[PDB]
Amino acid sequence: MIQGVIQKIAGPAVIAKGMLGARMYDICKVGEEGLVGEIIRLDGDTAFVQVYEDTSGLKVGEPVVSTGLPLAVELGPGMLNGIYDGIQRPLERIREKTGIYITRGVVVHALDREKKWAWTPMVKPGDEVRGGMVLGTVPEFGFTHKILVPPDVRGRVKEVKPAGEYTVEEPVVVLEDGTELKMYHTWPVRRARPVQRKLDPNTPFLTGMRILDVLFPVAMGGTAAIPGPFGAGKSVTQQSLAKWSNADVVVYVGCGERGNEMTDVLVEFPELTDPKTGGPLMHRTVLIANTSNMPVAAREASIYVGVTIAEYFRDQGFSVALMADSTSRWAEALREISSRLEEMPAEEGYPPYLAARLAAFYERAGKVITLGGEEGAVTIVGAVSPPGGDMSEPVTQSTLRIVGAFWRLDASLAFRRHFPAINWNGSYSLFTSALDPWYRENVAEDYPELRDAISELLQREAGLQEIVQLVGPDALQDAERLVIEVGRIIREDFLQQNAYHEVDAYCSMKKAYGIMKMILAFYKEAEAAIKRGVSIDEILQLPVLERIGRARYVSEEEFPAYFEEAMKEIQGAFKALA
Amino acid sequence: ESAGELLVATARTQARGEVLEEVRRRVREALEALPQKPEWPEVVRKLALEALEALPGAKALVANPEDLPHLEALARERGVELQAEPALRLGVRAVGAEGKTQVENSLLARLDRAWDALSSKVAQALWG
């Protein structure tokens, strides 16, 4: 066990001396406190350690011990409904021990070693197991957590525990080689967990927001980026994605953000109900919380921990969603550490390998065939925070080369309280054509043409808005007047969404389809009536517009009747108008 | 269309792979039994000699204890020390003057270094 002494301290970086024999990217214990660090450069007899804690008060000459292992996480039953910090330590245990502050150096296990899980086996003596197969299952909040073989183990079963209640560190299956498999195992967070085969995404990932689900869809194993300047409500959108998605498990990574957001989750989610099952919402969520005033070098650790936990739950056969709350903070941590190393930087002070780390992180997503043979997926939605709302910075330009969807938030929409404040002129998506076969069987037969008609309507109205900018709405004919009015109708009755209404917060696909159909039908009837001589005034004064305005505040089960009646009224409002 | 052609070409390629692998295994087994042959000592001497000729100024020689006595009569002539070791087989490995430089002249090593160069010859001589 290599052990040396500290030689030089500067910020979060510590140079240890006497460490000949320490491996790159191993874990160390710095100081007599035992702070956790990782070796990122070897030189002569020394080693360069980045510390995941506060290095204040350290002294030269203190012990440094290398453990010989890379950063790893404990994967097993007991992670759901918990909250962790950047290196997977349960924050509730820290609170039970050391009060309302986060002092450094506490040691707790990630999975509770005193709980009892109702084990139910699935193998017999003499059977053959290889990496990724299923030994048995354990219930957890209504899920069925199934115990997997660690991805690099082979052998033949020698005995099994007989269906009792045990703790996680109870060896349940022993192989003929003598190796023991418990209810948990470890994995290095920088190595992607392997799969058998990558598949192509064919199923939408429903977020609950109309504009994202209709105009810029993302597929089940896809990747999205949502960069937005401050004051554009990025936090509300992320929380809504966490609250209404159709994923089985949500992993929320708060990499360098406000702490009140983590508190909002912790307080509200135990009250809300899971749509899929009957349970509370918190029972399907895992949080990793590394706020803005916690140690800087732990933000990257938190990113990697989150994506490894998501990969584990995917390997179990679920479909996971991973929300990385901000990747600009991870980029800033990278920049700081590279600054301590005296490296030459790339364009905006960032290290020259930032794009490689980003690409390797986003490339862990996708639909797969797991090693056990079942099918799971992982969807990544990463947030960015460009400095001046400037989409030409390094992080945004490196993220836009690997994501499949781009949801661009805008500040002009937010300064007039138009929420979710997504700019439909700068956004795009690359999954929309491969998803049409699903839309045609599961929403409506002609949903794609509805969506396309809405899009071209929006494009035309935004185009001629430039003309009306100068010469006033008085100077153009009734057709363009109707087009501007229909644009206003769309972007106040369809694109908007109140996130604090008990009805408008979540919106299904059938409902969005209904509203789109209503609007298009009205537009056609109005165009006919106009070209047979009526004016815009009587068109605007109609009351059915009030019916379409209140359409999004209608509950889901009582929407079909509302839709039928509104179609009848749309017909009658112009039939009686000759 | 071309799918059948791909099938037949895959079959041909993997058949050639099988036979070349077999030839390589054949010579791997032919090598690993030589220390029972009467040419063993002189080949080991010339191997150690070209090894020492590759390190001008070695300080030692590592070998196998079982063939250690084959190797005493030729290192005294130049002063390079001896040392035996069970793991090194079918060859000899020198050590440079600083301790930070080595040269190994094992049999299987030369085999793995030359097999790729000779694969073309084996193909041209085992088919046409």
């Binding site: - | 059948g4 037949v8 079959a11 041909r12 010859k121 085992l126 088919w127």
Partner: protein, 40 residues
Amino acid sequence: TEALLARYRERAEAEAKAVREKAMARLDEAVALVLKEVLP
């Protein structure tokens, strides 16, 4: 429609056997040549 696949499966297996036998012909010389060359 499938007769092409059948014909090609036949051709593949035939050529595989042909190559294997044409190889087992002179493998005994190939191995001796390689052992000659690898040796110092």
